From a paper:
Substrate-binding proteins (SBPs) are key structural elements of the ABC transporter system that determine the substrate specificity and high affinity of the ABC uptake system. A typical SBP consists of two α/β domains, which are connected by a hinge region. To understand their molecular functions, we performed a crystallographic study of single domain SBP from Rhodothermus marinus (RmSBP).
The crystal of RmSBP soaked with HgCl2 (RmSBP-Hg) belongs to the monoclinic P21 space group with the unit cell parameters a = 92.84, b = 97.86, c = 101.98 Å, and β = 90°, containing two RmSBP molecules in the asymmetric unit, which is a new crystal form and diffracted up to 2.0 Å. The two RmSBP-Hg molecules in the asymmetric unit clearly showed an electron density map for building all amino acids from Glu27 to Leu182. The crystal structure of RmSBP-Hg showed a strong positive Fo–Fc electron density (>7 sigma) on the Cys145 in the loop between the α5-helix and β5-stand, which surrounds the α5-and α6-helices. Hg2+ interacted with Cys145 and a water molecule at an average distance of 2.57 and 2.27 Å, respectively. Hg2+ was surrounded by Ile122, Thr126, Val132, Val163, and Met167 residues. In the RmSBP-Hg-A molecule, Hg2+ was buried by neighboring amino acids, but in the surface structure of the RmSBP-Hg-B molecule, the conformations of the amino acids around Hg2+ were slightly different, and Hg2+ was observed through the hole in the surface structure. The Cys145 with Hg2+ binding in RmSBP is conserved in RpSBP but has been replaced by proline in the other SBPs.
Numbering used by the authors: 27 to 182
The structure:
């Protein structure tokens, strides 16, 4: 498992200057009590504002995404897991479609998202953390791979 503070620090280097990121979090996902204050401390360690929009059903996904954009002006979407609601194609395809229309990058929990249009995911290696990047989409959305990570970055 790549930890949230590890993902946010990777996000800071992949999208330099990012200031506001939005998280769609399934309220039913386990470890909610551990993950949400985890996100806020990663936010304080990075200087990136992390707005968390929780969803309990598929119906809540669209209003919560739109609220993140209209009221919080997030510049990217961050999805941490997909064990329940966020693993259903209806929620994934919406989040990917509309983030793509808004020109914002999506940091995703598995390669399935990158095959559908998301920008970046990650996996823990013997060597630490390796990046997986959809190049053509990530390039177009302002993602830059630091040379310190060019070696340890696969391109879907
Ligand atoms: Hg994207």
């Amino acid at each position: 498992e790549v930890t949230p503070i590890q993902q946010l620090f990777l996000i800071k280097e992949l999208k330099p200057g990012i200031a506001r990121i939005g998280v769609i979090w399934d309220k039913n996902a386990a470890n909610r009590d551990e993950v949400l204050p985890q996100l806020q401390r990663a936010s304080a360690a990075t200087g990136i504002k992390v707005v968390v929009a929780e969803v309990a059903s598929l119906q809540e996904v669209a209003p919560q995404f739109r609220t993140l954009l209209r009221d919080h002006q997030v510049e990217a979407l961050w999805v941490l897991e997909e064990s329940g609601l966020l693993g259903q194609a209806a929620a994934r395809s919406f989040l990917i479609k509309n983030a793509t229309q808004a020109g914002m990058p999506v940091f995703a929990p598995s390669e399935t998202w990158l095959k559908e249009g998301a920008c970046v995911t990650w996996r823990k290696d013997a060597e630490g953390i390796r990046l997986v990047v959809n190049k053509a989409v990530a390039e177009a959305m302002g993602i830059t791979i630091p040379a310190k990570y060019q070696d340890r970055t696969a391109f879907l």
